[PDB]
Nucleic acid binder design. Structure first.
Ligand SMILES: [Mg+2]
Ligand SMILES: [Mg+2]
Ligand SMILES: [Mg+2]
Ligand SMILES: [Mg+2]
Ligand SMILES: [Mg+2]
Ligand SMILES: [Mg+2]
Ligand SMILES: [Mg+2]
Ligand SMILES: [Mg+2]
Ligand SMILES: [Mg+2]
Ligand SMILES: [Mg+2]
Ligand SMILES: [Mg+2]
Ligand SMILES: [Mg+2]
Ligand SMILES: [Mg+2]
Ligand SMILES: [Mg+2]
Ligand SMILES: [Mg+2]
Ligand SMILES: [Mg+2]
Lengths: 184, 173, 234, 179, 91
RNA sequence: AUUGUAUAACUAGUGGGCACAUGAUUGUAAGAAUGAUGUGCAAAAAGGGAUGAACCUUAUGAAACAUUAAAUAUUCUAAAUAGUAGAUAUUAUACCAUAAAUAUGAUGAAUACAUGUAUUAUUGUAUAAAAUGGAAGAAGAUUACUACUUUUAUGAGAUGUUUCUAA
RNA sequence: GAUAACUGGCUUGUAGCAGGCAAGCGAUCAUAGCGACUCUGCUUUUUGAUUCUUCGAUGUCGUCUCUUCUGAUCAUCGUA
């Protein structure tokens, strides 16, 4: 338990940040985000183009939270400058899979998964969209301004499209994430 | 000497505020409570559900009509807390309960009347800082309170809008 | 000790306790949801039960069939509109705002409101002014969310019933706009509407009524309990 | 004791210098004298603690002893905070153990009472169960604990989180600031 | 405001705050050493104090010099002062 | 230490006992059976253990005023939410109304060795299953729980001061 | 009821239901599935041991009809 802990975060010039009491507002070219920081028991001071977070007389369970809330707010800076992109490619054996997109990238429709008649629907989270890729012919890319909406949606397709009641070490049919890069 | 007092119940612990009121009634005053859906209950949300679920199990087996009743509204739930402090069976406690009134949010009559707070019951000055808690009306939505949305809108608009001498001294002497 | 063999219980606990109803025309507890896109239309009616016969019909499945079904007949004369209410939303719940009646009210409603000596009480009373009703309709249009009308029946056209008191009811109006709903209902004062306007063929309904009476009954006809053996006393 | 609610500058325990010997007899007149320092609340409690210590190192029963003289020691305090290191032996459920602590206080009477406050949580024993060996003033470069070494560095500044009300009344109106 | 050597302090309650003190040394995260007006040194926790907005330099001073920087109406006279504001609201 | 001590004559009730503390014999064990020393209930008031024959303070006529013991001070309920610190598990009873072998975490705790591996002390969770709707006395409490000190106050035919009745 | 046959109460030898350690079986592999020699528990559902309440009286075994409750779950539901 040290006396003084400190963390610094350097912002770029194109991403503008202004804060009221215990609330953040990020405005840049590729979108907008707002963040609530009132729940934590810490101090927030915006200096000249840098965010400083200080914390006095903490124990070991409170020291570890200072790094986590730093990296969470660090991701929201780059997310408004550069969007994210997650590429998920479907692998199949003896059957084929068709991808249908409805209402401008808000609904993904999956058909003929292992030869079943009932199609599956998936909604998208807040501030995200899905597009096809005609080049690689077997994958799609989820692109959005914010990271936790994108990374939650890709995890939803992987868990819901697995096969149950059968031997999973033999069948090997699903949708799997290939790469995670930024939009630019 | 007996006074009439309007109390804002927000930012208060639920059990500790009801302790100080029950002595204030037994000396013969009159008191009214506003915004009882914003009191605080300490602890996680997960224990506070388990406590209320055990209260919903007690019912009379022979005739369930003549059994323990479970009120849902945050006004009528706050009245059951204050009744545990007062000897409500004798004549001494029957009189003190006739001077108590609680309400949901802020009604129309009390927009201009002042309010008070208790410094022995506020959360910033009662406990240690940095532990988890929950509200009262947040808990009662899961048990079947039909209307928690309209009360939030009407009260917040109310809480937004409020945020020749020397001659007479010589003549009268 | 435990019970030897398993068996379900006799009777339903959803209807305990069993009491006689307080009125002969029960109110409606629920009404369907309104959509602001669709047209303005009523939701209810009042009728009288007549009898029962049977018809036959066809169904193809290829070859046809002959099915024999039993139908029932309800005799429905027209109904007249004579009032408009309004309800608002509060913190506690729905609360009434105002009530506006028409000018000339039939004596059938006067028989319903005032039982005996209805000629004495109705002659003494008097109506509202122009200025009273112009304030109430304004306070309906600004504060209401649910608008309902008042409908009374016409039992004097069926002389078998020996009835001159007319039953009254409340019927919700599901339509486009709240201000548009009041202007529709003010037009229809003292004007009738038939059964053909609301329901068409192939539309499922709900029926609200009162059952037949059977008096003081035993245990077997009330619940369904198995009798005792023949040898038993008492 | 004006600002605080208990006397933290003059604790109940004090410092007494004791001395005793045996009662003279015919076989042995003029016997040996001993001396020590025990920490207690009065000289009667310090008489009982010291006579039990003389039972263990030598076979001297306390019924045959005689108390010579006991005086109290006080220190002219200036007010500078110093560093102290206490070594002691405490009795617990399983047996005896010996440990070592480092503190920071004004005088060695006050630095002893900061040990009793820490021992109320970590050890959970009555105050008569700890036997103190020695108290010494520590100079620099002997500090073996980072807690003392963190506060010894000069020019310290750190704020305070405000959580105490400034009025002893039953009710105040809303928007009065308890600063 | 911070905790430092020379910070002026007072009792916490808004009444009964007539006497002030100066921090001499820092013991721990929650304990401080003061100097009264009489000259005795008291050890007292932080939770009994409130801070004032003034800092002195005591790096070289003696004992007595820090004590340097530390430092009735009847019923008839309360009849006049009530009378003066009585007419100002009457106008 | 005791103002008396000692000696005769006449006559009633009782001879099914039980409990607490210390220590034993038989029995797998028992609110089981049977002995030893002390004090009680029986035959003993008031105050406290929520309630209870035996637990804890405590000697006796009718009353008034002040001081304490046993036990308590958020509210029912007379009396300061008067201090340092830790506990996340719907935690909290002297007799007293149950929990084990075993497996693993955490401390600005200590000692040995190379920021971490070994032991020791304190402490948390799992192990932990029942018959109408439930018992920290209850409402409820995370500063009303647990550990260790100093002050203030409330509170018994107790103990002091005054009036009156009994050989 | 100073003293048995029936209900209730304290106890758990007997009854029932679980645990800890790991010699071995399983084609090699202790722990997929089982587990010797030993050790620690819970429940009141068999049968005992004792004699606290009832002998100026509390109607015994089994069956028929009917309601409600417990988890140590036979199917039905969700996972590994
Ligand atoms: Mg499987
Ligand atoms: Mg039938
Ligand atoms: Mg017969
Ligand atoms: Mg007797
Ligand atoms: Mg008694
Ligand atoms: Mg008890
Ligand atoms: Mg009181
Ligand atoms: Mg007193
Ligand atoms: Mg006496
Ligand atoms: Mg007395
Ligand atoms: Mg007997
Ligand atoms: Mg029986
Ligand atoms: Mg057995
Ligand atoms: Mg009977
Ligand atoms: Mg009988
Ligand atoms: Mg189970």
């Amino acid at each position: 338990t040290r006396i003084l802990t400190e963390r610094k975060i350097s912002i770029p010039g194109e991403c503008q940040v202004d804060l009221t009491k215990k609330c953040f507002t990020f405005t840049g070219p590729k979108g907008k985000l707002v963040h609530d920081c009132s729940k934590y028991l810490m101090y927030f001071t915006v200096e000249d183009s840098e965010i400083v977070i200080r914390l006095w007389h903490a124990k070991r369970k409170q020291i570890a939270l200072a790094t986590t809330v730093t990296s969470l707010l660090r991701n929201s800076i780059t997310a408004v400058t550069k969007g994210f992109s997650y590429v998920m490619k479907a692998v199949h054996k003896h059957f084929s899979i068709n991808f249908e997109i409805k209402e401008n990238g808000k609904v993904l429709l999956i058909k003929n998964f292992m030869g079943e008649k009932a199609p599956r629907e998936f909604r998208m989270k807040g501030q995200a969209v899905v597009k096809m890729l005609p080049e690689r012919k077997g994958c799609i890319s989820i692109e959005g301004p914010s990271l936790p909406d994108v990374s939650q949606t890709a995890g939803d397709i992987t868990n819901a499209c697995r096969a149950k009641k059968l031997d999973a070490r033999l069948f090997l049919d699903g949708i799997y994430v290939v790469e995670k890069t930024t939009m630019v | 000497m007996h006074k009439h007092i309007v109390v804002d119940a927000s930012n208060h612990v639920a059990g500790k505020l009801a302790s100080k009121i029950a002595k204030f009634l037994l000396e013969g005053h009159k008191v009214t409570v506003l915004c009882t859906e914003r009191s605080i209950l300490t602890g996680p949300l997960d224990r506070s559900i388990l406590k209320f679920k055990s209260f919903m199990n007690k019912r009379c087996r022979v005739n369930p009509r003549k059994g323990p009743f479970h009120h849902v509204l945050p006004s009528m739930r706050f009245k059951r807390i204050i009744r545990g402090m007062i000897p409500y069976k004798f004549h001494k406690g029957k009189e003190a309960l006739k001077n108590l009134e609680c309400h949901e949010g802020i009604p129309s009559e009390f927009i201009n009347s002042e309010r008070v707070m208790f410094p022995e019951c506020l959360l910033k000055y009662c406990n240690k800082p940095g532990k988890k808690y929950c509200l009262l009306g947040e808990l009662l939505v899961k048990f079947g309170w039909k209307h928690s949305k309209i009360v939030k809108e009407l009260t917040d608009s109310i809480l937004e809008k409020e945020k020749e001498l020397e001659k007479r001294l010589l003549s009268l002497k | 000790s435990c019970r030897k063999f398993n068996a379900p219980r006799h009777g339903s606990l959803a209807f305990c306790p069993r009491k006689r109803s307080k009125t002969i025309r029960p109110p409606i507890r629920a009404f369907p949801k309104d959509d602001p896109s669709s047209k303005i239309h009523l939701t209810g009616f009042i009728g009288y039960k007549a009898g029962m016969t049977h018809v036959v019909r066809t169904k193809t499945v290829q070859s046809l069939k002959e099915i024999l079904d039993a139908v029932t007949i309800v005799e429905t004369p027209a109904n007249v509109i004579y009032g408009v209410t309004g309800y608002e939303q509060t913190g506690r719940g729905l609360k009434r705002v105002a009530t506006v009646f028409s000018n000339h009210i039939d004596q059938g409603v006067l028989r319903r409101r005032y039982g005996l000596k209805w000629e004495e009480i109705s002659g003494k009373l008097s109506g509202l002014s122009i200025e009273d009703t112009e304030t109430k309709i304004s306070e309906i249009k600004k504060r209401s969310c649910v608008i309902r009308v008042l409908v009374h029946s016409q039992p004097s056209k069926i002389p078998v019933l020996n009835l001159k008191k007319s039953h009254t009811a409340e019927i919700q109006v599901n339509g486009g706009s709240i201000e548009e709903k009041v202007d529709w209902a003010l037009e229809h004062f003292e004007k009738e509407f038939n059964v053909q306007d609301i329901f068409g063929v192939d539309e499922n309904l709900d029926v609200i009524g009162v059952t037949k009476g059977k008096g003081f009954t035993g245990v077997i006809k009330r619940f369904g309990v198995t009798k005792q053996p023949r040898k038993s006393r008492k | 004791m004006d600002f605080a609610k208990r006397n933290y500058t003059v604790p109940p325990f004090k410092e007494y210098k004791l001395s005793a010997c045996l009662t003279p007899t015919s076989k042995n007149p003029q016997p040996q004298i001993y001396e020590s320092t025990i920490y207690a609340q009065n000289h009667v409690f310090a008489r009982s603690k010291f006579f039990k210590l003389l039972n263990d190192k030598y076979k001297l029963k306390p019924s045959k002893l005689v108390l010579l003289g006991a005086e109290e020691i006080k220190e002219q305090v200036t007010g500078e905070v110093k560093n102290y290191g206490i070594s002691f032996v405490f009795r617990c459920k399983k047996g005896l153990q010996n440990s070592y602590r480092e503190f920071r206080a004004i005088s060695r009477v006050s630095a002893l009472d900061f040990l009793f406050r820490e021992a109320a949580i970590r050890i959970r024993c009555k105050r008569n169960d700890i036997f103190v060996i020695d108290i010494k003033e520590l100079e620099d470069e002997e500090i073996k604990t980072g807690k003392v070494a963190e506060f010894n560095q000069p020019d310290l500044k750190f704020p305070v989180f405000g959580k105490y009300a400034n009025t002893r009344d039953l009710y105040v109106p809303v928007n009065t600031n308890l600063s | 405001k911070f905790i430092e050597l020379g910070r002026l302090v007072a009792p916490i309650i808004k009444k009964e705050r007539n006497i002030k003190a100066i921090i001499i040394g820092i013991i721990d995260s929650t304990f401080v050493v003061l100097k009264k007006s009489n000259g005795e040194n008291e050890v007292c926790p932080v939770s009994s104090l409130i801070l004032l907005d003034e800092v002195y330099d005591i790096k070289n001073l003696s004992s007595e010099e820090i004590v340097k920087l530390i430092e009735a109406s009847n019923d008839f006279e309360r009849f006049k002062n009530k009378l003066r504001e009585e007419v100002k609201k009457n106008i």
